[PDB]
């Protein structure tokens, strides 16, 4: 007949949602005298919406985020030091065009990673690729790749993503000789793509963390040229905020 042939052709053209809903769309267009062009547009638009949803699902899967969070679950009353409007502006993703780097600095547990992942999620929503990594982990992976000789592959893996979320810069300290990998990543992404950094160590401690003063100075010179630095002043939310607000 024709219904089975339509189903088969929709499946062969990779249009599952179209195969599911074509009968209902046809009936609705029938009951409202919808033009043929608008009927086709409705079908195509539904298919596009579903495909974009699945694409966003795949991108969030490959982002390698430890978890999923958003600005909705964030309270700016507990963080009054920094302006709320600036974060909302960042949510517009105007920094992706400017290629500016976003830095969150503050004591542990003050919500750095939360905000970074929220911004990354906003970027992933609108199609931009995003990769989440810990600085020490990134350096270790680059070192292993260099030892194996195929360093450029991993370097491209780290440089291609539009948004790079490097977290826990100061949490762990690898052999200083490997800091050149971090410098390579930061310089290659320089003036090309934004970088989202989050850490609890001042800018002076970088020389100690990487075990090199001039290398850290150059890394910061490039990472801070086009950037918007947010310094979060407060106390560990999970413990201090609840303890001080339950009183």
């Amino acid at each position: 007949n024709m219904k089975e042939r339509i189903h088969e052709y929709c499946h062969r053209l990779h249009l599952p949602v179209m195969a599911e809903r074509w009968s209902a769309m046809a009936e609705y267009a029938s009951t409202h005298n919808i033009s043929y062009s608008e009927f086709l547009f409705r079908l195509l638009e539904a298919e596009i919406v579903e495909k974009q949803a699945r694409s966003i699902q795949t991108l969030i899967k490959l982002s390698k985020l430890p978890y999923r969070k958003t600005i909705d679950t964030f309270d700016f009353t507990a963080q009054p030091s920094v302006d709320e409007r600036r974060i909302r502006e960042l949510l517009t993703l105007s920094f992706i065009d400017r290629k500016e780097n976003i830095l969150f600095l503050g004591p542990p547990g003050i919500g750095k990673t939360h905000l970074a992942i929220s911004i990354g999620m906003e970027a992933i929503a609108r199609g931009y690729k995003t990769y989440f990594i810990t600085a020490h982990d990134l350096v270790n992976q680059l070192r292993r790749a260099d030892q194996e000789g195929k360093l450029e592959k991993k370097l491209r893996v780290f440089v291609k993503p539009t948004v790079l979320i490097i977290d826990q810069m100061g949490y762990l300290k690898l052999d200083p000789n490997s800091a050149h990998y971090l410098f390579q990543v930061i310089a290659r992404r320089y003036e090309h793509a934004p970088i989202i950094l989050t850490s609890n160590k001042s800018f002076g401690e970088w020389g100690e963390i990487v075990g090199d003063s001039v290398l850290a100075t150059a890394m910061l010179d490039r990472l801070l040229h086009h950037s918007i630095i947010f310094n979060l002043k407060g106390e560990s939310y999970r413990l201090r905020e609840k303890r001080l607000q339950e009183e």
């Binding site: 547009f41 919406v49 949803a53 999923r68 309270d75 609840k242």
Partner: protein
Amino acid sequence: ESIEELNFLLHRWLDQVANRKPNATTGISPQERWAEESLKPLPLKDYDTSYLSYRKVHWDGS
């Protein structure tokens, strides 16, 4: 017939007998030991456990 009804009955049953009958080994009502318990305080805001999906709005707004 409804899971809400079942949960209500279960909580009532627990608070009636399950957490009231003395244990066969401790030999004391569980609620007294509960009063003896010292648990760490709860955070004010609970860890949000809700499905988070991203969707796109159609042309018309549906």
